[PDB]
Design a protein around this ligand. Structure first.
Ligand code: CLA
Ligand code: CLA
Ligand code: CLA
Ligand code: CLA
Ligand code: CLA
Ligand code: CLA
Ligand code: CLA
Ligand code: CLA
Ligand code: CLA
Ligand SMILES: CC1=C(/C=C/C(C)=C/C=C/C(C)=C/C=C/C=C(C)/C=C/C=C(C)/C=C/C2=C(C)CCCC2(C)C)C(C)(C)CCC1
Lengths: 75, 141, 75, 73, 339, 39, 68, 73, 339
């Protein structure tokens, strides 16, 4: 039960980053031109260069977990 | 003299690259502030600041001011770690006070570590800093 | 498993993945070098490991530079 | 990390001044230290040793690998 | 010296100067060597910066502090505020340095040959033996020192009036002053605008008025012992008299740091630099008005900003010793934080 | 609550409390005053 | 040496050579090593992965220097 | 470490491109990219599907050395 | 303080200031050093804000909180909110900083030369000895402090009427209040619209009425001790009198944070910035109308928001010391979660 609470927090973090720190609405309009991105880093010590142009003006870590493709298949 | 090190204000490699300095923080003029700050240093042929550590007080901010600021803090961490370890050694259970730190005793030692170099000289003079070789566990040679 | 994912990474890029010409022609990512170079350890060294890690070592100063950091971090 | 973060000017580049000084004490005037053999007015170069025109030509040519120019790398 | 009741305080090497505080002969030897080191710095660093002096540039921008002091007295200055003679700076820098060798010899005399305690000595050294708890002996020491400080202030008034002439920063020349002020009301009016006097004839007359006061004060302290009201309200320990001296010289340091930075008469701008703006940050500091680059700090920003910190850290040194004289053990801080 | 104070005073928690506070100092110092290669 | 006496181990082969120990018991039975000494630091003793060693060892009179 | 240093510094000296060592040796990616990856290019092409050259034995030895080093593990 | 029946409670170092409670001599020494620290911050940060101030932009946009307090009082302003003076700012910032050193000397006097308990000595010091259980002596202290606060409120009354006059933000000038509004009906009417006060004569006239109320109440507490009903409803313990003062200073802190944000008369817009809007997110904060660039705030937005957060945590400290005075152990919160 405690392990499932860890996975549910981890699952909730993926949906929260998709909700708040992602271009999922931008990606859903143009899936063939906008890259998926759901992690935005804070601008500190030069690490803001990692927020690359993933299309649509959004800047963030280009995610490879496939969550955007999962959520489009979930509706 | 550093004849192979032009200053960055008169270094043409730095002058062509300081106009394209990126912003490291949320401030949009972070690369402009870094361009003015690094101009006072000594630059090489590739327009990057080369630091001088030999002991010159013109370049004291390159290493000596980092050295003074580090050794004070690193002396502070070592001294309050040593003084906490001595104080908990006299207790009934010295073993459990390392995995379960007496936090009010730890804060008492840590705020007192700002006068560590005066306490280190005094404890070295009193003989309580350095133990004698006869009183130390020793390998069988 | 490292050979499994290396077999996966090379066979997809050489013989599956790539861009499509409008008349139906397909050119691949590594131009079909699996049939002649994945028979040899040197081809695995040169045409897979040396060639496709050019993107992780030239990634410095860009958005993929964290992958350049983490590639040295794992080394 | 700072080169990866697009800021190679933030590198800690330390000039090996102590080793560049020893190159200057053998006669290499590239670094501007006028000490011993890179100083023509010092007693180590005033004494007229017969190696000195051959040595100072070879140490300052740069086409050899005698005393290579050394930097932060 | 405060002993906290314990008669046998041993003292470590870092507090090793506290060992001779009850020894009269060794008290002379360390103080005379201090005056040897003080006159050596007045002698060697006058000769150090006369070698580094460039007569084409202004000596304020060069970073020299002792040549502007002698140039304000009126040595080596022509008709245009420049420097033409390097010899009176060399003579005074030699006279101070030879007198440091006499003082450096007399300190080694009082260390080795003279006894550690002057009560052992028979002759005139038994009269020179002072104890800290003897107020009648200390006023004789204080009164004789007030005589030489009064004679020093009259010698400066003598140097301006007769033996040469002072510098006039208004007219940019060395001017022999004649007939200074004698009314006590203008000196009493100088408590307000002390740092903006801008008058040689009132500076010398003020030095006449304090020269006659210090000599007359030294007459009173030699002839009359402490009355008893000062014994009741002031302590008479070894560290107590040092506390009053460190407090008194911190106030003199704070005045001289302020008088250097804003006054133009005794610190002329062609000798020192522009009058400093009183800035303040995480510490008070008098910053340069003209702001000469490459970390210049043109020789009045070195006098004023050193004599504030040296006055602040003597104010901290006055507080360390007055707390010690009043009876604070200073280890009771550590037992306050103990469990 | 007393054993909760002991668990919060354990060696893993207090080193993660200190290193968070140390990283809290260093990130904030390099946010308002970035790019300090020298003094 | 009595019970509770503080000694320093002069036996070179021991783990506690140069360390201080406390005398727990002295056997009056003609033992070669009659003095049982207790230590505040356990030795290396035990299998690999054991969290503690043994804090007691038997010594003779010639291997102990008086401390307290 | 020292023979990587000797080789990469001298590769710049012999080619005249001393600035390639000077701008890249201060960080370990420059050693990894501009020295290890870059200079191994003609080595690993000692033999390829398109033929061989005189670096074929050195290409085989370089992989032979990888095998012996990993067999030691 | 509160002992909870444990008689001799040994406080630790983090609660080390509870040790000198029920000790009258060290009670003076900590509070005078607090007054030394408060007058130091008044003195140093006036001179600190002089060294940063430039008359190009306004004082509110710079981040200056002490100079607009003196500009509203009517010293450094020439015409229309323009700061062309800056010397009465330096006088006030030096009078306060010298008075900090006088207070800093007297704090170390009661540390060392006065005992921890004032009942030990004799002669004008046993009358100054106070115990927390004595209501007669605490009202004598309260009556004299009301007389000082009443004369301080009457000091503003003489300041506007005679000594230079207050700044009038409505006319953008400095005027002497010749006719203050000495009407008790309009002052009692200002208990509703105290925020929207715009008349300088009503501001000074309200200060006359409170400056005579505190003086009249100061005479009342000196002559008359606390009565039998005040003993029954108010606890006369060490931590209870502190908790009454902490609640009183938190209520004043909320009122002063509300006077800062919305007033234009006592806080003119050209000195502090535009008046604030009382926002509330998860806490009540006062936000600026226009957005000052580079993530900066006006000095009115810094005074009002800090004094809300100071008065909130001083209300929480009032709650901490009221429950300890009433008898709540605060280890019962641990004993409730353990149970
Ligand atoms: C006129 C000056 C005066 C006099 C005569 C004394 C006399 C003495 N003090 Mg001192 N004191 C004063 C000023 C004075 N102090 C000031 C300036 C401070 C504040 C910092 C104090 C604070 C102080 C403390 C904290 C202590 C005393 C004590 C002592 C005694 C022995 C000190 C000793 O052995 O030093 C030996 C000298 C050294 C170990 C050298 C230390 C060097 C320091 C760290 C650096 C200072 C120089 C630095 C480079 C800056 C130079 C700037 C310059 C170039 C412009 C002796 C009675 C001690 C005591 O209570 O004994 C009874 C004691 O513990 N004093
Ligand atoms: C302005 C610099 C100055 C001056 C002039 C003195 C002067 C004095 N100090 Mg001294 N000292 C100073 C700096 C100074 N100190 C500093 C910086 C330190 C800290 C490192 C000390 C620490 C110190 C110690 C540890 C002691 C003195 C004592 C003395 C006396 C030694 C000579 C004597 O009485 O013969 C007769 C002396 C003896 C019979 C025993 C002392 C033996 C030698 C001569 C002590 C010399 C130590 C030396 C001064 C340290 C140099 C420090 C610095 C100048 C490099 C002398 C009166 C000594 C004293 O008062 O003892 C009576 C004492 O024990 N000093
Ligand atoms: C300014 C500090 C000072 C103090 C207070 C002393 C104090 C004293 N000096 Mg002097 N002395 C000093 C500096 C000082 N001296 C220096 C700088 C030197 C070198 C000129 C000497 C060299 C000196 C000699 C050579 C003699 C003394 C001696 C005397 C004693 C009094 C003699 C007298 O009344 O003369 C009138 C007394 C111990 C005499 C004494 O009793 O010492 C043994 C002695 O022989 N002094
Ligand atoms: C460098 C300054 C100096 C020093 C350190 C002393 C020190 C002393 N003087 Mg003073 N005195 C001096 C200069 C000095 N005096 C001069 C220039 C005059 C003016 C003519 C006098 C005339 C004077 C009088 C009239 C008396 C003292 C007294 C005092 C004592 C009390 C201080 C006081 O009045 O507190 C404030 C103190 C020990 C009193 C005493 O009893 O002497 C010990 C006293 O009655 N002094
Ligand atoms: C041996 C340890 C070492 C040294 C001496 C430094 C020293 C420095 N680092 Mg650091 N750094 C290091 C390890 C080191 N770093 C490592 C391990 C990393 C990778 C995690 C970084 C990555 C890093 C970055 C990305 C930045 C610093 C920055 C800085 C500066 C800190 C200024 C400050 O906070 O005050 C200073 C030049 C900052 C700076 O100002 O760069 C010049 C900055 O932006 N460092
Ligand atoms: C590249 C590195 C390498 C190589 C060559 C070996 C070799 C071997 N591993 Mg392995 N191993 C490695 C690294 C390596 N290991 C490391 C890193 C670990 C530590 C964790 C292990 C731990 C280990 C375990 C725990 C196990 C093995 C086993 C084995 C065997 C696999 C089955 C077999 O015989 O295959 C055939 C042999 C090869 C593929 C080796 C290359 C042979 C070439 C192709 C032929 C050369 C022969 C030559 C022409 C004739 C000689 C020339 C003459 C002049 C002398 C084989 C002997 C397993 C085993 O013994 O199973 C039976 C076993 O249980 N390994
Ligand atoms: C006029 C102010 C006043 C007075 C005179 C007292 C007096 C006292 N209180 Mg306190 N109290 C007050 C305000 C007051 N309180 C307020 C405002 C708070 C709310 C936070 C409290 C809450 C409080 C608690 C929780 C406790 C007391 C206790 C104490 C006693 C010892 C305090 C001590 O030694 O701590 C010395 C101080 C420290 C060790 C520092 C604590 C560290 C904090 C985090 C510092 C705050 C930093 C802050 C951000 C500073 C910046 C402010 C601003 C510029 C941003 C003493 C009787 C103790 C008690 O029960 O009595 C025995 C105790 O446990 N008080
Ligand atoms: C800073 C404000 C201050 C303080 C802290 C006190 C505190 C005190 N007042 Mg008050 N009072 C003051 C100013 C103040 N007063 C002023 C301005 C006046 C004039 C109106 C008075 C006139 C006054 C009266 C007439 C009485 C009190 C009383 C009291 C006590 C009961 C509190 C109360 O009524 O609870 C709610 C309490 C000790 C009573 C008391 O104990 O008398 C001494 C009492 O009878 N006060
Ligand atoms: C970090 C500490 C801090 C700082 C530095 C300040 C700073 C400020 N406070 Mg303060 N404040 C703080 C803590 C602090 N506060 C806290 C903890 C409280 C309780 C919540 C308050 C409550 C508060 C109020 C009640 C007021 C301020 C205000 C002020 C300003 C002027 C105060 C003044 O002139 O005193 C006045 C000086 C005295 C009281 C000294 C006594 C003077 C005597 C009685 C007069 C002379 C009498 C004699 C006989 C003639 C100043 C900018 C004022 C403001 O404008 O804020 C928006 C204001 O009205 N403060
Ligand atoms: C007591 C004591 C001490 C102290 C001492 C001191 C520190 C002092 C110093 C002293 C000194 C420090 C002295 C002085 C001297 C000087 C000198 C020795 C110099 C020389 C020179 C001369 C003499 C000359 C010069 C010249 C001229 C003038 C002119 C020109 C030329 C010529 C250059 C030649 C001690 C601590 C150690 C120890 C203990 C005891």
């Amino acid at each position: 039960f405690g392990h499932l609470a860890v996975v549910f927090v981890w699952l909730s973090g993926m949906y929260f980053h998709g909700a708040k720190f992602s271009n999922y609405e931008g990606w859903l309009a143009d899936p063939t031109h906008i890259k998926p991105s759901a992690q935005v880093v804070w601008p500190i010590v030069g690490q803001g260069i990692l927020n690359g142009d993933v299309g649509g003006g959004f800047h963030g870590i280009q995610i490879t977990s496939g969550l955007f493709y999962l959520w489009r298949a979930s509706g | 003299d550093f004849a192979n090190l032009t200053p960055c204000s008169e270094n043409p490699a730095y002058l062509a690259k300081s106009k394209n300095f990126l912003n490291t923080t949320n401030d949009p003029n972070s690369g402009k502030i870094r361009a003015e700050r690094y101009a006072s240093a000594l630059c090489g042929p590739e327009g990057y600041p080369h630091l001088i550590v030999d002991g010159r007080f013109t370049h004291a901010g390159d290493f000596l001011i980092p050295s003074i600021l580090f050794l004070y803090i690193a002396g502070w961490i070592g001294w309050v770690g040593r003084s906490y370890l001595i104080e908990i050694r006299e207790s009934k259970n010295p073993e459990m006070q390392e995995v379960v730190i007496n936090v009010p005793l730890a804060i008492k030692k840590m705020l007192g570590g700002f006068l560590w170099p005066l306490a280190a000289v005094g404890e070295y003079t009193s003989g309580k800093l350095v133990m004698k070789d006869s009183e130390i566990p020793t390998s069988p040679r | 498993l490292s050979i499994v994912i290396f077999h996966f990474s090379w066979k997809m890029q050489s013989d599956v993945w790539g861009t499509v010409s409008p008349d139906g022609s397909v050119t691949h990512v590594t131009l079909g070098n699996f049939a002649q170079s994945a028979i040899t350890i040197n081809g695995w060294l040169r045409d897979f490991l040396w060639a496709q890690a050019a993107n992780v070592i030239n990634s410095y100063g860009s958005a993929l530079s964290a992958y350049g950091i983490m590639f040295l971090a794992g080394h | 990390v700072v080169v990866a973060f697009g800021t190679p000017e933030k590198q800690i580049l330390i000039e090996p001044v102590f080793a560049q000084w020893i190159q200057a004490t053998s006669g290499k005037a590239l670094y501007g230290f006028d000490v011993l053999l890179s100083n023509p007015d010092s007693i180590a170069s005033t004494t007229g040793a017969a190696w000195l025109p051959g040595w100072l030509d070879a140490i300052n040519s740069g086409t050899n690998s005698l005393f290579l120019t050394i930097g932060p790398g | 010296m405060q002993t906290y009741g314990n008669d046998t305080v041993q003292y470590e090497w870092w507090a090793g100067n506290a060992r001779f505080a009850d020894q009269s002969g060794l008290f002379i030897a360390a103080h005379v060597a201090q005056a040897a080191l003080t006159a050596f710095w007045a002698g060697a660093f006058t000769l150090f910066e006369i070698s580094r002096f460039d007569p084409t540039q202004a000596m304020g921008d060069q970073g020299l502090i002792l040549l502007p002091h002698l140039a304000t007295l009126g040595w080596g200055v022509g008709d245009g505020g420049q420097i033409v003679d390097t010899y009176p700076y060399f003579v005074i820098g030699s006279i101070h340095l030879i007198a440091s060798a006499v003082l450096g010899a007399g300190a080694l005399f009082h260390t080795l040959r003279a006894p550690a305690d002057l009560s052992t000595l028979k002759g005139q050294g038994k009269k020179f033996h002072f104890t800290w708890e003897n107020p009648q002996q200390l006023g004789i020491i204080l009164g004789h020192h007030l005589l030489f400080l009064g004679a020093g202030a009259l010698l400066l008034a003598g140097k301006a009036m007769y033996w040469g002439g002072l510098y006039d920063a208004t007219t940019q020349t060395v001017r022999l002053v004649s007939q200074p002020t004698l009314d006590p009301l203008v000196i009493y009016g100088y408590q307000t605008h002390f740092a903006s006097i801008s008058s040689l004839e009132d500076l010398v007359g003020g030095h006449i008025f304090v020269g006659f006061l210090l000599i007359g004060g030294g007459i009173w302290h030699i002839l009359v012992p402490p009355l008893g009201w000062a014994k009741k309200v002031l302590l008479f320990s070894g560290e107590a008299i040092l506390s009053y001296s460190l407090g008194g010289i911190a106030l003199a340091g704070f005045v001289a740091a302020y008088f250097c930075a804003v006054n133009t008469l005794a610190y002329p701008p062609e000798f020192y630099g522009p009058p400093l703006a009183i800035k303040l940050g995480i510490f008070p500091y008098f910053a340069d008005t003209v702001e000469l680059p490459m970390h210049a700090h043109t020789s009045r920003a070195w006098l004023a900003n050193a004599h504030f910190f040296l006055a602040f850290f003597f104010l901290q040194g006055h507080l360390w010793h007055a707390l010690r004289a009043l009876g604070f053990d200073f280890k009771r801080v550590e037992q306050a934080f103990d469990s | 609550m007393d054993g909760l104070k002991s668990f919060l005073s354990t060696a893993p928690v207090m080193i993660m409390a200190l290193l968070t506070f140390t990283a809290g100092i260093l990130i904030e110092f390099n946010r308002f005053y970035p790019d300090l290669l020298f003094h | 040496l009595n019970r509770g006496d503080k000694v320093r181990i002069k036996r070179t082969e021991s783990y506690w050579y140069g360390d201080v120990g406390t005398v727990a018991s002295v056997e009056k039975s003609g033992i070669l090593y009659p003095v049982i000494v207790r230590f505040d630091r356990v030795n290396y003793n035990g299998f690999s992965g054991s969290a503690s060693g043994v804090n007691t060892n038997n010594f003779a009179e010639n291997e102990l220097e008086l401390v307290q | 470490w020292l023979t990587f240093y000797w080789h990469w510094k001298h590769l710049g000296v012999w080619s005249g491109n001393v600035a390639q060592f000077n701008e890249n040796s201060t960080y370990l990616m420059g050693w990894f990219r501009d020295y290890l990856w870059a200079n191994s290019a003609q080595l690993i092409n000692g033999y390829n599907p398109y033929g061989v050259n005189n670096l074929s034995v050195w290409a085989w030895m370089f992989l032979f050395g990888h095998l012996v080093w990993a067999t030691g593990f």
